[PDB]
Amino acid sequence: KCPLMVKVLDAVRGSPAINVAVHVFRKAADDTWEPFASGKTSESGELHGLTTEEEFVEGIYKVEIDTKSYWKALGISPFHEHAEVVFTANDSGPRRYTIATLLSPYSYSTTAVVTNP
Amino acid sequence: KCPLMVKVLDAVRGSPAINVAVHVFRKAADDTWEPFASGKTSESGELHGLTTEEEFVEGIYKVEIDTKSYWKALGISPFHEHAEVVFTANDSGPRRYTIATLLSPYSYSTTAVVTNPK
Numbered sequence: 001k002c003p004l005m006v007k008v009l010d011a012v013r014g015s016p017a018i019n020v021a022v023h024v025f026r027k028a029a030d031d032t033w034e035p036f037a038s039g040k041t042s043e044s045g046e047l048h049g050l051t052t053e054e055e056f057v058e059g060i061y062k063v064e065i066d067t068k069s070y071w072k073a074l075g076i077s078p079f080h081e082h083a084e085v086v087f088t089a090n091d092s093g094p095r096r097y098t099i100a101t102l103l104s105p106y107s108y109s110t111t112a113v114v115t116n117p
Numbered sequence: 118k119c120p121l122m123v124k125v126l127d128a129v130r131g132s133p134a135i136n137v138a139v140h141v142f143r144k145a146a147d148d149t150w151e152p153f154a155s156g157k158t159s160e161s162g163e164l165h166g167l168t169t170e171e172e173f174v175e176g177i178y179k180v181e182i183d184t185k186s187y188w189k190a191l192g193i194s195p196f197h198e199h200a201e202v203v204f205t206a207n208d209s210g211p212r213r214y215t216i217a218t219l220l221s222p223y224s225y226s227t228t229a230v231v232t233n234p235k
């Protein structure tokens with residue numbers, strides 16, 4: 001059981017975006033962002049096992065993807081410092097969240113797939 | 118003569134996203150986000166006149182678009198709290214920046230168009 005999954009693709013090369021740093025944060029009571037989990041995407045551009053059902057309670061989360069580092073390593077000058085995804089996790093809706101982001105030097109697209117499957 | 122322009126479109130209705138709130142921040146000397154400019158998109162889904170060439174110095178800027186309020190006003194409970202765009206501006210001299218964002222309830226796409234003053 002994996003409640004939160006992250007997927008990153010490269011629109012320049014038509015490949016998974018590998019070894020991309022991802023930091024997850026949870027909004028705290030003082031309105032500040034508290035480190036929650038982190039990792040680097042795998043050979044398939046994915047990051048799993050960030051959290052468990054027990055720890056993933058309702059609240060506001062921020063997913064930060066270090067896109068600038070990724071492009072620099074390819075020798076490409078990017079526009080964005082990073083890509084950020086801020087959302088509320090609600091117990092009402094589906095239980096699994098997939099955050100998928102597509103990267104270009106000057107653009108990114110992000111989508112969420114929320115399922116019970 | 119307008120160094121920072123914001124354009125927002127609606128992918129569900131195929132139209133400009135009107136009355137969208139936009140807040141711009143600049144990273145301060147102490148690593149905090151200081152208020153820089155704000156406005157609402159017009160009928161054309163555009164926001165102009167946020168700043169001048171003079172005030173828009175080199176720095177790290179954050180454009181925050183209030184997408185949650187936009188969707189809620191339409192009857193939709195969207196996924197994201199807001200759309201945020203963070204970038205370094207003018208570090209090799211003055212440029213003109215257009216930040217364009219396309220909205221759907223569970224997805225958004227953002228692109229930048231950067232040009233060298235005419």
Ligand SMILES: N[C@@H](Cc1cc(I)c(Oc2cc(I)c(O)c(I)c2)c(I)c1)C(=O)O
Nearest residue numbers: 007008009044045046098100101102109113
């Ligand atoms: N191995 C993982 C990888 C994976 C997940 C998704 I979700 C996906 O689908 C999209 C579609 C679009 I359009 C995007 O911009 C993006 I990013 C992802 C793709 I490709 C691959 C898995 O299959 O388990």
Ligand SMILES: N[C@@H](Cc1cc(I)c(Oc2cc(I)c(O)c(I)c2)c(I)c1)C(=O)O
Nearest residue numbers: 122124125126163215216217218219226230
């Ligand atoms: N008057 C301003 C307004 C304007 C800018 C852009 I840039 C643009 O083009 C796109 C293309 C895609 I694809 C998008 O998802 C989005 I949002 C905008 C359009 I139409 C209009 C100008 O022309 O200066």
